Amino acid sequence: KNKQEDIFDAAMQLFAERGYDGTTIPMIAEKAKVGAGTIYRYFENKEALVNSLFSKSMLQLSEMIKTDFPVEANIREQFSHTYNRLFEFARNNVDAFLFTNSHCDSYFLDEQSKKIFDDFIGFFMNIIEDGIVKGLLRPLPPVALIIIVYQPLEKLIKVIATGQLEYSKELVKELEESSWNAIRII
Amino acid sequence: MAKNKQEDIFDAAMQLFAERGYDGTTIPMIAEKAKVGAGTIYRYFENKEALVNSLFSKSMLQLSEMIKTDFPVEANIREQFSHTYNRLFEFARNNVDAFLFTNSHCDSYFLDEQSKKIFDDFIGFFMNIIEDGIVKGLLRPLPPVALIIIVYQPLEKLIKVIATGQLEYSKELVKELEESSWNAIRII
Lengths: 186, 188
Ligand SMILES: [Cl-]
What we know:
binds chloride ion; Tet_transcr_reg_TetR-rel_C_sf (chain B); elongated; mainly alpha; homodimer
């Protein structure tokens, strides 16, 4: 909904400019142009709001990658699909991406937010483990290969968001080829 | 013989900068965690900006030394990469605290002119090698800062993951991470 979305957008801008601990529900109500009582109809408190935001973002990233996932294709294509859908999600949901990326291990996260994230991670662990066994990927610990793919992307999104680097189809194409070469057997 | 309390002060400051943020941390807080008097910290450093600049400068110069020592100038970019990567991993492995801090605050507002000149002289050295590699058609035609990120960010996170005990260090782990990073930046 446009109400839910403006509450989350207004909450993200305040969490970034005034910190999560410093932000309150009335501040989000003022920036979203709604009543504090209407926010309390959707969310019991700020911790419920930030867990609805985190969870929805994770399931949107999970939907984006899992939608049209090329199950019958090779490792190369499954990687290409995952990488581009991951980059496209980050690119279009930078605040949510930068916010979700910055709070995966936060103290305010609830059991469902953690189960959503672990179920998402585990999906790629199993593909990576299958790739290692077939001799298709480097025999590195699966968590080391996720780090190799994810950390450069995560930082490049941050650097693009500051305007230090600029997005282009050519840049993602170069970054995707680089990440595939980093994890495959040569 | 008068022992240098700077190591204990830097360790105490980083634990507070990590748990309470650099802006939230003060000199009395560092004095309490270091188990020293506030006045003894002010003997070494005029303020928190001086302390943090000393910490930054010292770490960057110890990392610079670790890579520039026995640097294989007459070797190919493959060997120069291998040398750089291993010396970088060895420095990070043995100086876990300071390495993470320093390379995450290399564009911070609190860095003085000398800290910035130390860092710019260090990074520019690798920018030149990367630019030569791109021109020769050996490295990927990516912005040089994107190739530094590709090499550095996975390493930085693997050090953090090893530091939690989730992953364990081994000579074969670094050998494989080094081959992976070279394959990430070269034209195959
Ligand atoms: Cl900080």
